[PDB]
Ligand binder design. Structure first.
Ligand SMILES: *[C@@H]1O[C@H](CO)[C@@H](O[C@@H]2O[C@H](CO)[C@@H](O)[C@H](O)[C@H]2NC(C)=O)[C@H](O)[C@H]1NC(C)=O
Ligand SMILES: *[C@@H]1O[C@H](CO)[C@@H](O)[C@H](O)[C@H]1NC(C)=O
Length: 495
């Protein structure tokens, strides 16, 4: 174990300072039947502290009671992680090797928060320091000059390998393109309003479908295989006049037909047919309409494994989107493929120590779990103090901020708020019921670990301490209390 080295930067909480020779860490997971484990993080400085208490056989009183519903079974969990963008890899590798390993350990190791997903962009997005695709030779329909640049061969891929080496959980890779080569596009530019030329089934559309295959082929050459790909990052962006950075517009009908006609068959007839395809990969406000358009066409649906969703954590309904969508296509998983904060005009892109941005992460993770979402992926794994680099200056926050000049990195509250989920909810976990005995201000979600034991996260975004008890009929009652401005993960064995 190693405790947080705290440092204040003038906001509501501290960051934990890590460097080449030190970084906060866990002991390996260890609790007997009849006892419960509690991980606590507080605005006042506690960082996933471990403590244990007994489970009571009896309970008197009329304070808040949350009853576990073991037998109400909801979605199963895919996992948790972040994006290996050019900017993140760039920042990580600018540190000294020993510090690089602590950073990777904090995310990917049982000594850290056990991430098991990595989103990887296919070529450049806005967190890149130059625009480029894998096929920048014009009119190269055959993709003869398709190749991975150094951004993949010297930064992302090696970093990915090391993450996998460090992880004990099996890790899944997820890939998303921002833009195709510009000669495949009506506007001939990496950004701006513009889409694939011609129409689905045609040679522009076939070339693009093969580009996915070539991407996967090249990655498979560096011994990496993907769990899933998205059909396109924020397809809706490329429909917007003057959109500032890399994009490719699809209407839902364009996406439907492109999937049915080109990308589905192409992927299916290739050695990567077990790779899953997710559609949308955009704001949840495009639901349920996008889902309806794509899935009620059997020729497209037969290829679509799930629906990927984005969150701008600064803004903010979910039931009329996630809810309705799940209702309509219960067997098509919802998956959060991107989240983030740092745009509220009045506040810095990176606020070091921000407990509020922390709360925003887990509040969102919980709302997602409550609406059937099966996994959650943060945006940039790491960023500099300015919130980049980003070639369009589109800076934002990241759970780990790298300070190259001091060979230091900072773990923000956000990190720990993620940790309260990622570290304790392995793939296979199943969300189950948790009913409250009365209106309260807590946020809480309960799941069952594959092994049969229980996880419950309780978040408290008010300033008041909230005393409460959790009933599980198999074992008894957890008397506990939830400190204002805190998040707890509770674990206890069930048989
Ligand atoms: C990395 O950070 C660690 C932890 O803060 C630093 O080690 C501390 O250094 C100061 C000054 O030497 C001591 O007062 C503390 O007792 C140390 N803590 C521990 C547990 O060693 C170390 O200085 C940092 N490394 C660099 C290069 O700055
Ligand atoms: C494309 O590849 C060919 C052979 O594969 C190579 O000789 C040539 O330099 C490349 N053409 C361009 C435009 O780079």
């Amino acid at each position: 174990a190693r405790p947080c080295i705290p440092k204040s930067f003038g906001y509501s909480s501290v960051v934990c300072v890590c460097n080449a020779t030190y970084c906060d860490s866990f002991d390996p997971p260890t609790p007997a039947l009849g006892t419960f484990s509690r991980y606590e993080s507080t605005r006042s400085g506690r960082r996933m502290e471990l403590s244990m208490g007994p489970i009571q056989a009896n309970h008197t009183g009329t304070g808040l009671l949350l009853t576990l519903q073991p037998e109400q079974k909801f979605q199963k969990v895919k996992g948790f992680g972040g994006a290996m963008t050019d900017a993140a890899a760039l920042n990580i590798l600018a540190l000294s090797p020993p510090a690089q390993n602590l950073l990777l350990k904090s995310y990917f190791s049982e000594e850290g928060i056990g991430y098991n997903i990595i989103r990887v962009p296919m070529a450049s997005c806005d967190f890149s320091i130059r625009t480029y695709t894998y096929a920048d030779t014009p009119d190269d329909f055959q993709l003869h000059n398709f190749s991975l640049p150094e951004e993949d061969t010297k930064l992302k891929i090696p970093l990915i390998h090391r993450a996998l080496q460090l992880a004990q959980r099996p890790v899944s890779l997820l890939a998303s393109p921002w833009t195709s080569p510009t000669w495949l596009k009506t506007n001939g530019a990496v950004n701006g309003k513009g889409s694939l030329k011609g129409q689905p089934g045609d040679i522009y559309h076939q070339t693009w479908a093969r580009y996915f295959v070539k991407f996967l082929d090249a990655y498979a050459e560096h011994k990496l295989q993907f769990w899933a790909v998205t059909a396109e990052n924020e397809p809706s962006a490329g429909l917007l006049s003057g959109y500032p950075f890399q994009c490719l517009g699809f209407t839902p009908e364009h996406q439907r037909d492109f999937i049915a006609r080109d990308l589905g068959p192409t992927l299916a007839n290739s050695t990567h047919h077990n790779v899953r395809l997710l559609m949308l990969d955009d704001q949840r406000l495009l639901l349920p309409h996008w889902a309806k358009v794509v899935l009620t066409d059997p020729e497209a649906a037969k290829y679509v494994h799930g629906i990927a969703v984005h969150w701008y954590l600064d803004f903010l309904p979910a039931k009329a989107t996630l809810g309705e969508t799940h209702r309509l296509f219960p067997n098509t998983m919802l998956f959060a493929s991107e989240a983030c904060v740092g745009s509220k005009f009045w506040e810095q892109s990176v606020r070091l120590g921000s407990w509020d941005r922390g709360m925003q992460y887990s509040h969102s993770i919980i709302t997602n779990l409550l609406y059937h979402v099966v996994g959650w992926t943060d945006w940039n794994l790491a960023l500099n103090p300015e919130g980049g680099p980003n070639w369009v200056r589109n800076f934002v926050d990241s759970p780990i901020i790298v300070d190259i000049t001091k060979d230091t990195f900072y773990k923000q509250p956000m990190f720990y708020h993620l940790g309260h989920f990622s570290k304790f909810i392995p793939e296979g976990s199943q969300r189950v019921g948790l009913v409250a005995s009365q209106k309260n201000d807590l946020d809480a979600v309960a799941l069952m670990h594959p092994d049969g034991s229980a996880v419950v996260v309780v978040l408290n975004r008010s300033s008041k301490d909230v005393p409460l008890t959790i009933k599980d009929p198999a074992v008894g009652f957890l008397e506990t209390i939830s400190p204002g401005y805190s998040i707890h993960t509770y674990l206890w064995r069930r048989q």
